[PDB]
Design a binder for this molecule. Sequence first.
Ligand SMILES: [Zn+2]
Length: 396
Amino acid sequence: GFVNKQFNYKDPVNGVDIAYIKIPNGQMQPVKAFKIHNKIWVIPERDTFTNPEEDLNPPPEAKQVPVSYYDSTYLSTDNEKDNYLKGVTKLFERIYSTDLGRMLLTSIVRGIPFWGGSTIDTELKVIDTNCINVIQPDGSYRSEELNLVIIGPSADIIQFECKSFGHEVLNLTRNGYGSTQYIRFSPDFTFGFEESGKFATDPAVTLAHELIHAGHRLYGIAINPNRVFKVNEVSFEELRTFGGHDAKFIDSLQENEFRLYYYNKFKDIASTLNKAKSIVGTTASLQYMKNVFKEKYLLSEDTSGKFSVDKLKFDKLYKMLTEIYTEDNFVKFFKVLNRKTYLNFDKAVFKINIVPKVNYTIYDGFNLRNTNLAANFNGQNTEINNMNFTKLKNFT
Ligand SMILES: [Zn+2]
């Protein structure tokens, strides 16, 4: 029970797990959000807030390959939002039902972005863009730290991504610090791939993929989006995240270099904590925050309270986040069918509804046990289980 409540969109606010909230950065209207687990919120809204140079209508020419889909009306009624909310929720339980997913979700919750927001080296301070403003029933607002936000897509409904706010000169997703992660995602759409057969990607696999990215970013160990490999042009970060054949397009030499790099980033954090003499805010004590970051980076502490990075513990956590959490391994754990390589050429978009248990369950996805859909991945077969996959026009 990763989500300990069956949330309904229409449910009254309480200021704790159902509340109207504001996102950092412009004078925006508050939106209804749901805290489905500690550190993890879902905002059933199209993401028009954080990125002002993006309108929800099709552009003059849609170029996202193999597929793109536009519908400015999607996610604009209470009923859609409820279905959105229940879909995302079901996907978290599905992910969490696996050992791999239990592990990744635990890491994500532990992955509190570092309090590196002060101008003074000896002072710990929360970065404000790693928070949200949560309205209480008393009408007042409280600033709250969070790690993950699942938000609805922007103009291109099937363009799913992991985004976060920057902070001055600091590279939060790449300096060991981390930052709150916003995942644009819809459980109401999926995309096709071919195999030997017309199949649909399981949306748990797609969400897990974004959570892996999120995991990298929360631990500030993401690889620069500029490091890319020519595939017959794809980022190291994506290849690493997909795993399988593709994750070995990366030479162990570069793999080794990154390990040491991010080891020293963790070291720099450990020393910062050791040299900390003050903290900003009324909420948490400096020792409390020390303990929080000790838990996140798995730091060792001596009898003096001084921190150090244990190699064994770093190597294991690092390997987990970069080599064990991969789309490929989620596929193995779910026992579903998925495209074999990162690059996809199947040009199919589908409208799905995973909320009713007759369509999709936590344990089997579309490939329901004690049904015909449990044979040969038939539930994902867009021809066999055609009632579950509404073929939509591709905008590309
Ligand atoms: Zn990705």
